[PDB]
Design a protein around this ligand. Sequence first.
Ligand code: NA
Ligand code: NA
Ligand code: ZN
Ligand code: ZN
Lengths: 70, 11
Amino acid sequence: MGIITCICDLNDDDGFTIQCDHCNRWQHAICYGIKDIGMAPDDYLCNSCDPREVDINLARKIQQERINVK
Amino acid sequence: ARTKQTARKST
Ligand code: NA
Ligand code: NA
Ligand SMILES: [Zn+2]
Ligand SMILES: [Zn+2]
C-alpha cells in the first residue's frame, strides 16, 4: 500500500525510505541511522516489528527540521 | 533490504 510508518511520527516521503521485511510499512532510512543504501543490511525489520536501540528524539528532530525548512 | 530513493538533479 506504500504506507510510511516511522519512529519520527512524521510520515511523509523524505526521499530515502526502506521497507520492513515483516509488516511491509516503510521507514525513513535516516531515522534508523541508515545514511545511504550501502548502510542498509540484507535483512531489515522496523522498530515496531523488532524493538531496537534507536534514537527516536534524533529521528523526530531531523524530520521536523526537513519539514520546517521546505 | 528493499529501498526507495529519489534523486533530484538540475541539469
Ligand atoms: Na508513525
Ligand atoms: Na531517509
Ligand atoms: Zn522517520
Ligand atoms: Zn515492521
